[PDB]
Amino acid sequence: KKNIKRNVEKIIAQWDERTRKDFGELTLSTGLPGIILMLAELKNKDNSKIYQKKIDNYIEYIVSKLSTYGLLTGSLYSGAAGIALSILHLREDDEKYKNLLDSLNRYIEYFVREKIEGFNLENITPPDYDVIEGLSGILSYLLLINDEQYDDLKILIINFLSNLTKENNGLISLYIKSENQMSQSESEMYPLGCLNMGLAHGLAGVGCILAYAHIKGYSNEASLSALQKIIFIYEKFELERKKQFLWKDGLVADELKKEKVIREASFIRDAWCYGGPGISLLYLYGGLALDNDYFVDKAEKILESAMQRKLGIDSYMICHGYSGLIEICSLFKRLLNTKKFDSYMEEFNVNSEQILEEYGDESGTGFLEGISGCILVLSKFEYSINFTYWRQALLLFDDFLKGG
Numbered sequence: 001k002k003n004i005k006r007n008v009e010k011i012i013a014q015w016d017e018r019t020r021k022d023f024g025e026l027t028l029s030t031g032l033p034g035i036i037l038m039l040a041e042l043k044n045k046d047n048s049k050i051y052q053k054k055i056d057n058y059i060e061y062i063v064s065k066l067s068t069y070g071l072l073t074g075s076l077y078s079g080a081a082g083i084a085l086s087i088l089h090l091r092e093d094d095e096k097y098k099n100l101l102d103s104l105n106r107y108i109e110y111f112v113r114e115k116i117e118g119f120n121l122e123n124i125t126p127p128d129y130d131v132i133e134g135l136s137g138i139l140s141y142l143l144l145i146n147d148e149q150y151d152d153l154k155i156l157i158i159n160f161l162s163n164l165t166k167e168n169n170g171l172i173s174l175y176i177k178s179e180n181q182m183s184q185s186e187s188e189m190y191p192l193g194c195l196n197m198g199l200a201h202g203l204a205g206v207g208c209i210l211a212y213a214h215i216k217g218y219s220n221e222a223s224l225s226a227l228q229k230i231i232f233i234y235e236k237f238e239l240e241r242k243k244q245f246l247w248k249d250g251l252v253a254d255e256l257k258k259e260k261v262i263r264e265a266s267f268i269r270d271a272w273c274y275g276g277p278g279i280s281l282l283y284l285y286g287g288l289a290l291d292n293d294y295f296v297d298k299a300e301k302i303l304e305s306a307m308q309r310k311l312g313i314d315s316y317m318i319c320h321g322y323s324g325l326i327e328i329c330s331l332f333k334r335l336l337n338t339k340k341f342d343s344y345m346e347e348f349n350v351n352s353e354q355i356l357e358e359y360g361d362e363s364g365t366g367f368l369e370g371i372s373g374c375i376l377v378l379s380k381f382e383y384s385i386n387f388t389y390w391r392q393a394l395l396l397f398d399d400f401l402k403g404g
């Protein structure tokens, strides 16, 4: 397939122009860190010395912007952890990469410690704890660093997350008040608030990160109890019968008090960020971390249901499109050696040319929603050695069974 090369070239031209002349451009979500990851994964390819030059260009461009403006966030998708993830594989190549990563890490530790200190549980909102902007996503990156100086930070985050699974409002903690929803659509969708049940912004994501922390060597009775409780909550509120393997995006106070779903959702979708595909990671990781065969076997059934169904899928993007579903299947196959998703993976790769050509320009070039995320997926099918840690950003943990 010669069409990856053409597309990459145009992406490079877009970013060469942009750097020759805003906040978004330093983010994993939409900016240079996602671009650096896509190009870095193309190292086997013929133009890889040109690609490494661009990477270094974009890196120097990044430090220059950091030196002038600073960062306001340590977050995986908008802050220092996403920038650090994007260059982590270069750590031992040159002193300049290691120097940059050390700065990022110290800022991250400062950032997290400062966040936990000024935390007010009454104002708890998803970016506090979540994958995209919060501590779960930051921990995903942190757990790739083997330096024991970060042990204290890791444990501080782990304890802080676990404690959010405790009952508060009499009963509550992770519950989000209507006022503290991330946008007004959600404020109006949830006028009495909700417990967010998505991977990206909710309970599954905390669960995954706690399971991953345990296999990495970082857990205590309380974090394991947080993980168990999270899975128990998924098991309790799972939809039934014709809606087996489905979950609403959010659970409201009364439903939680009743311990059943009361009001049906208007819109559930099959996505990484919300719904079955992302939720299947919780069961997979929980099942492997807790040595529960039932959870692992359920994880497969949940994902398989979503692959069959593809509820709400209208694009090939990572976040809530088909490339994200595919990459999750590829992770299942890698860890379990399951053949269940082989046909979907094969069909996606057969359709690869049409996927890139019809890929919207409206989604931009970035990782999370843009074309470069799709290229990353397609590229690791063609050459499965990962030169980078890009998968960490999606909580796809290739090392989950490598131990600690």
Ligand SMILES: [Zn+2]
Pocket: 271, 273, 274, 319, 320
């Ligand atoms: Zn999404």
